[PDB]
Amino acid sequence: KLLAQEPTCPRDADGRPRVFVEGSGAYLTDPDGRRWIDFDNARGSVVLGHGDEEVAEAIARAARGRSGVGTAWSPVLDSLLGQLQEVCGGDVVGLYRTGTAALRSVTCAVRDARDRSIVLSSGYHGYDPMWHCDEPFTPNQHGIVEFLFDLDVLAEWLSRPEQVAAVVISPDHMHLGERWYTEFTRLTKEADVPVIADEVKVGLRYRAGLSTPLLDPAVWIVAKCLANGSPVAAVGGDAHLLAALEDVSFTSYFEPTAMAAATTTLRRMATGEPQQAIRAAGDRFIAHTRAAFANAGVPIDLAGNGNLFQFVCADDEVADAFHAAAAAEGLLFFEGDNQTPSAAFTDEVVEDACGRIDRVSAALTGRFTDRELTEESWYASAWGAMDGLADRPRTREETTAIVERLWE
Amino acid sequence: KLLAQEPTCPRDADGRPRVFVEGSGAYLTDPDGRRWIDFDNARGSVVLGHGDEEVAEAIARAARGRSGVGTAWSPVLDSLLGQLQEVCGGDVVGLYRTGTAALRSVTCAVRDARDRSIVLSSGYHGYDPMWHCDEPFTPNQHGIVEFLFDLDVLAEWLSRPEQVAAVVISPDHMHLGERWYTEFTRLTKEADVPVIADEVKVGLRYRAGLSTPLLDPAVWIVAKCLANGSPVAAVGGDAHLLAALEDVSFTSYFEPTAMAAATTTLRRMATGEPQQAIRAAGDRFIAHTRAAFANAGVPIDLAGNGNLFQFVCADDEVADAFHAAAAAEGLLFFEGDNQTPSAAFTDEVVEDACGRIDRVSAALTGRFTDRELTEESWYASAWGAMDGLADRPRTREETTAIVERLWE
Ligand SMILES: *Cc1c(COP(=O)(O)O)cnc(C)c1O
Ligand SMILES: *Cc1c(COP(=O)(O)O)cnc(C)c1O
Ligand SMILES: [Mg+2]
Ligand SMILES: [Mg+2]
């Protein structure tokens, strides 16, 4: 009753936040002592695992003042900035406390440097009201045009390239492939319009770097993979587009526990070793689950890979039944959105999770055999998880019909 | 070089950041092993002392997953929200990662609820470009009117109150007295315009509550005194003005180390005991330093009190020489701004700092004896530390002259 905000979090079927009292690695414990396997992982920001020991020891030393103070530049900051530039590229780098703050700051800075008013956007960029819009494909009151990853609309807006400050996208790799990224980059290069790659979710997710070499971002942002859940985001890119960042400073800039979390995690994510382990383990879970449902006649498929995947259900009634059965087995999925295992999702947790999925599959068998995964199923599922239109062959008239069906 | 941002931090006379390796209580150690006394304390957010052990134990346990996980609601959140409402009041509360994010979100929410576009503002509210303006006393492109704590200008804008959504001020108590606040509240009550009290700096600074009962804020924000430097800011107040906060959610919302720091610190700040201890110790330092300078003919005075004070120097050459001498003695002041001791500024540290000040005063003696603090000295110093005009008697035409002198 006291909270004015509505934070995104796991909720029961009555909409009440699920409470978890502790976590370790891949397991959460609820107030009754029941253990759940976490695939949500603070919306994909816990990539090493809850309570990771190396990060925990670094945070504890930082909390005791051993690794610098919030008052001043610390011996480890240069190494953080240098590694961010080595891994992600760019002339210059910047730090923020949320993805939302980073996205607003760089978008305003790029727009100011470009002295142009229109920003073409796809994907979620945070909670700030500058991104709110009543309708797609037209400018909101902040000059932002949502284009739902539709390249026909993008091409039309880029046909008047001089009024476009930038194109900002949150890259998705479950439903957008090589053809989409090749054409996206072709259009933006042709228009000579800088690209802001919002990689808050996919930067460092798949490898020690940004998510695809088919993008040539003028500015990038990463965050969820950077600090095992501690509140750090980073940006980098062309110096002149980020000139306005000279005005950015905030009180907790040098706070040592955030710095310990980001440096310790980035050093490990820069080895590529966590992403390779998660990919293998998550891929085994996906393969098992896809086969389990298909053999049981359960109309649920999967998209994505071990690092980041989603469930595709025939309809919302199947999805509701799936989520209720998953919760009953102690599987904690980010409902309707993307599942992101951490490095604590090891071979033994995979076996546990596969066993829980066997019980989920048994619980759904015979209930929805008549339902089919349709083109509509895939569009609706993708929309819920990557905030726009899947790259599936479609006509322009179908684009309109899908958007009218799925908007709001 | 790599950093696109310009974070506020202690810098040498060439503008290079000073590095500190570790800190404990009130003492910092530099790369050469020299011990410095911190009066900056992460811009006033370290109020218990660097590496406070009780906070460090709470942070370390949270870092091991023992006190909730970033994935989900945990009991510590319920306790923090209740503590905030108990100490600061209000219908509802919200949490943010910086003061800047809190001020932008609250201001946007209040403007939306009030369905009016003009916001009257004094004081610093964070780094967001919404606060930037070319000129005081006129609306910027976001509808914000800077009025530099001038009540004649405020009265002028409030004489046509229906266009005014809110008045947001960062209360200063070094240069604005009880009569300023009585008239401010009289004017805003008369206009029936809600007040947003940006208490990011002074909330809980002087006692276990907001900074003055002479203000009647519809919405408050606190942060620097909340979490001993960990990145937490809080807001609260009238539910209808904060309705838009339902749209606020961010990935690290449930991050456990931040909540551990905030609950542990707030528990102590709620007793009023740290603020009383700091007041006493800082007052002893102020008294010693005022006399040391005055008795040596050094034209530097102090304003404020033990919780929050500043140096008032005759001119910029005196200020530069003072800062260089202080650094040479290992005194770390927030240059040109406010000094905010922590609860680790105990009798022993007071004695050490007073001896260091004796050497600063010795280094300055005989260099500036012929100079005096003028009204210009006081306006210039106050402008640098509290971001507007001191409450000194002046005409409307004199307001114009001071502002023309001091506006960048
Ligand atoms: C979550 C997310 C953001 C916002 O990050 P916060 O830290 O939650 O503000 C921005 N962009 C993308 C692509 C995201 O997934
Ligand atoms: C420092 C400060 C802010 C901004 O807070 P950050 O956490 O630095 O963004 C806002 N208001 C006041 C009064 C401040 O002193
Ligand atoms: Mg989503
Ligand atoms: Mg200041």
Automatic annotation (TrEMBL), chains A, B:
Its cofactor is pyridoxal 5'-phosphate. The keyword Metal-binding applies. The modification N6-(pyridoxal phosphate)lysine (covalent) is found at residue 224. Keywords: Aminotransferase, Metal-binding, Pyridoxal phosphate, Transferase. Coiled coil: none annotated. SUPFAM superfamilies: PLP-dependent transferases (SSF53383). Pyridoxal 5'-phosphate binds at residues 99-100, 251. The keyword Transferase applies. Mg(2+) binds at residue 337. GO terms for molecular function: metal ion binding; pyridoxal phosphate binding; transaminase activity. Gene3D superfamilies: Aspartate Aminotransferase, domain 1, Type I PLP-dependent aspartate aminotransferase-like (Major domain). This is C-6' aminotransferase. The lineage of its organism: Bacteria, Bacillati, Actinomycetota, Actinomycetes, Micromonosporales. The gene is gacK.
